[PDB]
Structure formats: C-alpha cells, structure tokens
Antibody
Framework: QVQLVQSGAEVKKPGSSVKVSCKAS????????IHWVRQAPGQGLEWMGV????????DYNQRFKGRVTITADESTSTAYMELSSLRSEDTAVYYC????????????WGQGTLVTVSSASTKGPSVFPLAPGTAALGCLVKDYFPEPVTVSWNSGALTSGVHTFPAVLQSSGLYSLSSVVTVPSSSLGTQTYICNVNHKPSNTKVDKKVEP | DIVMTQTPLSLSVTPGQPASISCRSS???????????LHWYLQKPGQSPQLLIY???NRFIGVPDRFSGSGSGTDFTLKISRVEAEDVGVYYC?????????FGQGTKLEIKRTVAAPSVFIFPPSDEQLKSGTASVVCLLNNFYPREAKVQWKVDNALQSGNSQESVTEQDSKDSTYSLSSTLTLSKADYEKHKVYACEVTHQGLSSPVTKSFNRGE
C-alpha cells in the first residue's frame, strides 16, 4: 500500500533550522513528485513547495524567501524539507504529500509533523490515573512541553468510546490533557485498563494502570 | 497568487439532509481542454486531508456518489446529498493549475443531531499526584449535544472561580455528540482542607442540573 511516514514532532529555538523527513513506500519513489504543505494551529493549508525526485528539480512558494529547501534521497526513498530562520509564525503541522498527474493533486499524505517554534525546554509529562453498569475511567497527562502527546488504551487495542481531549496551556506555560474511556463496570476487574502515553519530543513512554 | 474563496465558513446540517459548499477563484482554473485542476478535500479532526474530488467532478477511490463536484472557470461547488455523521470535518477546495498551489480557508461541517444529555463523572486526584504537591480534580461530561453546557465547581458547597480549565472534543464521527472535561487545580494543602468536591452540570438535555460529588478520604 502507498505510505508516507514522517519524522517525530519537535520544539526548535527561534532563529534555528528544522529538517523534516518523509519516508515513502509501496511505489517507485522517483516516479512521483513530493510536495510540502503546512498548517498553523487552527488555521488553513499553505503550500510550500515541490521536488521531482527523478531529477532533484524544485519549485518553492515565493513567500518563504529561500528559507525552504526540499531534497530527496532515492537510496532511502526519503524526501526532506528544511526550513531556516524559524519564526514563531512557523509553528505548524508540516505535511508531505505525493502528487500525480492522473489527479493533478496530493493523494497520499504523511501523518504530519508539529514543529513548535519556542525558547522553552522540552518537558516530559507525568501520567496519573482517573479511577472510577456503565463506568468511566481515564488518564491525566500533565505538565509537558511542547505539543503533542498521543494516548492509546489497553496497549493500543481499545479505540471505541475513547475521548482524548485537546490539550490546554496552563498559566505555568506547560500543557495538560486527559484521555477517558466509557467501559462497563463488570469489565473493570477482568481487563487491566492500561493507558499508554507517548510524548515523542521527550522520548517518554508511560503505561499507568487504572485500578479502582 | 490565486485566492480561493470558500463559502459558507461553517454549516450546521440535519442527518439525511443535503449540503453545498462553494469555491470561487480570483482567476480561471482552466489549464487546457478537458483539464481544470480544482479538487476537494475532507480533513477529519487530527487527521491528514483526504481527497474526495479531483479535477472538478472526478470522485476518488471509495468516494460515494453522494459527493459530487461541479463548476467551471472561477466558480465551483461541492455537494453532499444525504449528509451523514461520518461527514463531519473541515472541507477544503484546492487549485493545482498555477503555481503556487493554493487552498480555500476551509468550511467546518457540523451535524445537527437530536438533543443528548451528558453522562457526568467526577474523578478525585490520585495519591501519586498528591505526593507531588498538587491536586487535579476532573469532571467529565460524556457524549452530549449541543456543545453548550455550564460546569460549576463546588468545594464544601462553595462556588469556585478562576481555578478550573475546560477542554471540548470535536464532534464525534459516529454519534455526532461532544465530550467535555473540566479540571479543578488546587495545591495538596488546600485540597486537604475540604471534604466534598462536586461538579454541577447545566445542559439543554437536563430538566434540572446534575451534580456528581465525592468525599475526600474515601
């Protein structure tokens, strides 16, 4: 199947440079153009540029004024996007998309990479249980930076009735979020309700047991 | 650069009813004979944009006949006949005729389902968190409609202000409801000064406010 897998999220100091990778698989890499499109939080889609990996030829959106460099490596089937002189305005989810001439557009997209342009240090989250007919339980994921944190239930198995709330920025300048799961009472003793938290910028991986 | 004007910016739609989104470009998107590079994407919350329609009216793999695109030159329209729960998300129109490629500002599609009352749950802070010197009390409002709701924190029947934060999920793709969390943050010391922690929920789907509470120590 056609898949574009991007590199992990990260905080970058203002003025510095970030390089985002995009690993393509399930097709012949040099046959298709790879485009880069960004999305500032709560905002729209902004096209940044293109590379033809067959020739290494590029086209960039003029507004970036040479800050963008898109490259490709056929040995690894990996396209990269480098954005220099990082502005607080460059805080966005960066996407790579595979374009083709039968549609004329981006069909297969990567999962996106949130690059946060801040001066604040990387902080790993603390994870706490939200212990309980129909029952509710969850996980409080507190004091992390930057965004995002991903949460899964029962080692990545459960997804039905799983509400992972958007994070809130605290007065402290640290994020916090909760993940809840509306399960039955009978099942509370049967299955060990594991909350799997992952914060890719700090390599934290936490599995906290939620028991009454 | 070609400006893509999408209208309306938001839309509320009843299940089984049609919807229509319009895109207008600053210049013609005609590339050559039989080729207009105007596409439509749906982006469901926290997901990547997914192609629905390319080149004005072509439907992508798996895209149902309910989604139809039309138009020509500078004026185009996406139409959904029989809007379903799964159609919630943000719609974007795209042009790939002239560089730089441009997108519409997006159109948020919200479903207008029946009134659904929230199921309220309260969670006390964990002993493990208390060891850190802070207490987070959480109140969960699960699967409700509409989004509007009032959450009041009461500690020993005293009404709280300025010490709580809320978060609301986007509309659910299956039941079209919302979920909300309210977090009351107190120091370990202040938390220990009280017995009853309660969360009062006001919502259109509730005849009288619903209260869920716990006694600290139990």
């Amino acid at each position: 199947q056609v898949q574009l897998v991007q590199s992990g999220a990260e905080v970058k100091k203002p003025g510095s440079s970030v390089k985002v990778s995009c690993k393509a698989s399930g097709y012949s890499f040099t046959d298709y153009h790879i485009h880069w499109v960004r999305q500032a939080p709560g905002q729209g889609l902004e096209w940044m540029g293109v590379i033809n990996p067959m020739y290494g030829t590029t086209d960039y959106n003029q507004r970036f004024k040479g800050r963008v460099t898109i490259t490709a490596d056929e040995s690894t089937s990996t396209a990269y996007m480098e954005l220099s002189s990082l502005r607080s305005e460059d805080t966005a989810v960066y996407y790579c998309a595979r374009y083709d001439y039968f549609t004329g557009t981006g069909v297969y997209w990567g999962q996106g990479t949130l690059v946060t342009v801040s001066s604040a240090s990387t902080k790993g989250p603390s994870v706490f249980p939200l212990a309980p007919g129909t029952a509710a339980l969850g996980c409080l994921v507190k004091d992390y930076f930057p965004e995002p944190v991903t949460v899964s239930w029962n080692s990545g198995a459960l997804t039905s009735g799983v509400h992972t709330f958007p994070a809130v920025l605290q007065s402290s300048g640290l994020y916090s979020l909760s993940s809840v799961v509306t399960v039955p009472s009978s099942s509370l003793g049967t299955q060990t309700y594991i909350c799997n938290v992952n914060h890719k910028p700090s390599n934290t991986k936490v599995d906290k047991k939620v028991e009454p | 650069d070609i400006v893509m004007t999408q209208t309306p910016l938001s839309l509320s739609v009843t299940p089984g009813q049609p919807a229509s989104i319009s895109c207008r470009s600053s210049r013609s998107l005609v590339h050559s004979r039989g080729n207009t590079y105007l596409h439509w994407y749906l982006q469901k919350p926290g997901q990547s944009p997914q192609l629905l329609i390319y080149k004005v009216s072509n439907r992508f793999i798996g895209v149902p006949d309910r989604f139809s695109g039309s138009g020509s030159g500078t004026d185009f329209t996406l139409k959904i006949s029989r809007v379903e729960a799964e159609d919630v998300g943000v719609y974007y129109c795209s042009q790939s005729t002239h560089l730089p490629f441009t997108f519409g500002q997006g159109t948020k599609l919200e479903i207008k389902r029946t009134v659904a009352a929230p199921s309220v749950f309260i969670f006390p802070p964990s002993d493990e968190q208390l060891k850190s010197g802070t207490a987070s009390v959480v109140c969960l409002l699960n699967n409700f409609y509409p989004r509007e709701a009032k959450v009041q924190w009461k500690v020993d029947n005293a009404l709280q202000s300025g010490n709580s934060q809320e978060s609301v999920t986007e509309q659910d793709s299956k039941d079209s409801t919302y979920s909300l969390s309210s977090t009351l943050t107190l120091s370990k010391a202040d938390y220990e000064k009280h017995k009853v922690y309660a969360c009062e929920v006001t919502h259109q789907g509730l005849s009288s406010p619903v209260t869920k509470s716990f006694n600290r120590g139990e």
